[PDB]
C-alpha cells in the first residue's frame, strides 16, 4: 500500500543507485578527454598529421 | 686520382646488400630521459628506449649493436604524389658493444 515500512531494503538500494549512477555521470566527461584508451587524443593526432602532410599537388 | 665509381663498389654499404637483418654497430649521439638518438653509418638515425638492464652506462659517445629492418622508413598512401618520409631510421637494441 505505497508505504516503507517494509520496502527500506529497496528504498536504500535505490538512492544508491542515484548516487552510484550521478558519481559516474558527473566524472566521465572530465577523465575521458586525456585517458586516450591508448590513442591520441584529436588534438594530438592534428598537430601530428600537420607535421607530415599530404601532398596531392606538385 | 680513384674514380667515384670505384668508391661506390668498395664502400662498406654496398657490400652490406639488403639493409634487413643486418647486424651494424652504431654510436649515440643524442640522449633523453628514455629515448637514445643512435647513429648507425646510415643517411638518417634510428630511435630506440633505454633497456631495463644496465641502462645507466647508456651515455653520449657510447657505442651499441643494432639489427637494421628497413634503412628509412617511407611508405605511399593514396592521395599523394610523393611519398611521406619519416626521416629517421628503423632498428632494435641487442646490447652495448663488447670491446
Given at each position: 500500500?505505497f508505504?516503507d ?12 543507485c ?7 555521470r558527473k ?10 584508451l ?9 598537430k601530428?598529421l600537420?607535421?607530415?602532410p ?5 | 686520382?680513384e674514380s ?11 657490400q ?11 654510436q649515440?649521439?643524442?640522449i633523453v630521459?628514455?629515448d ?14 633505454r633497456p ?8 653520449k ?15 605511399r ?12 631510421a628503423?632498428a632494435?637494441?641487442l646490447?652495448?658493444?663488447?670491446s
Open positions: 500500500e508505504r515500512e517494509a520496502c527500506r531494503k529497496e528504498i536504500q538500494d535505490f538512492f544508491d542515484a548516487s552510484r549512477a550521478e558519481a559516474a566524472m566521465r566527461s572530465i577523465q575521458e578527454n586525456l585517458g586516450e591508448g590513442s591520441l587524443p584529436p588534438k594530438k593526432l592534428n601530428l600537420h607535421r607530415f599530404n601532398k596531392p599537388h606538385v | 686520382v667515384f665509381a670505384s668508391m661506390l663498389r668498395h664502400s662498406p654499404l654496398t652490406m646488400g639488403p639493409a634487413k637483418n643486418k647486424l651494424v654497430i652504431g649515440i649521439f643524442h630521459e628514455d637514445l638518438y643512435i647513429d648507425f653509418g646510415g643517411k638518417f638515425h634510428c630511435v630506440c628506449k631495463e638492464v644496465d641502462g645507466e652506462k647508456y651515455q659517445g657510447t657505442r651499441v649493436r643494432l639489427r637494421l629492418l628497413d634503412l628509412e622508413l617511407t611508405s598512401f593514396l592521395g599523394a604524389t610523393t611519398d611521406t618520409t619519416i626521416l629517421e628503423d632494435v637494441l646490447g652495448l658493444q663488447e
